[PDB]
Amino acid sequence: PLDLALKRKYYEEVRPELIRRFGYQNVWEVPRLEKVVINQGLGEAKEDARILEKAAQELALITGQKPAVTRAKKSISNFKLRKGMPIGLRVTLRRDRMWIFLEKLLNVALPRIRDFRGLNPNSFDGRGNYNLGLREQLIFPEITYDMVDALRGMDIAVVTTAETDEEARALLELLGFPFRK
């Protein structure tokens, strides 16, 4: 499925404008959106694989991709975790798999976010990267209402090939990332 609105948006719209604002030398100095990863730190369904599955396959639909598990290492008596038994539901995705998800996101999810006001401008980690938390996971397309047995949210991170985050700010704004500014 090599082709899509957002896929091209970057090329035939954003990309060239970056050359305006910064204007590099080589085509590979122009900042690439190239990595996006979901995650669900769930010490919640940590007990049972029942509450753990639905959140995984649910995740699977929104991403469209096959979600991965992540086990604990240390040990937390304060919140009942030892060897690695438990869980965090993370899933990496790139290529066109990600463009398709970002379209949904920046144009369907963020929109239906209760009293949205634009992605926090400060969520950039000094380097060319951005992350954000989300409550209700139902703000995703295919997700039905009668489907959710819990409002288990989650958080995501998106990587650039940029070095500084002004380039990432510029890059993301252009790509349709509504920032609170």
Partner: peptide
């Protein structure tokens, strides 16, 4: 499949995601 984001404010978007019956309430067109 090619998804179909049907919203009450036009903006009917296609992409890819199982079952294209995507009735979006208030999409980014508004």
């Amino acid at each position: 499949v090619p998804a179909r984001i049907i919203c009450g404010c036009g903006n009917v978007i296609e992409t890819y995601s199982t079952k294209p019956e995507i009735y979006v309430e208030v999409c980014s067109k508004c």
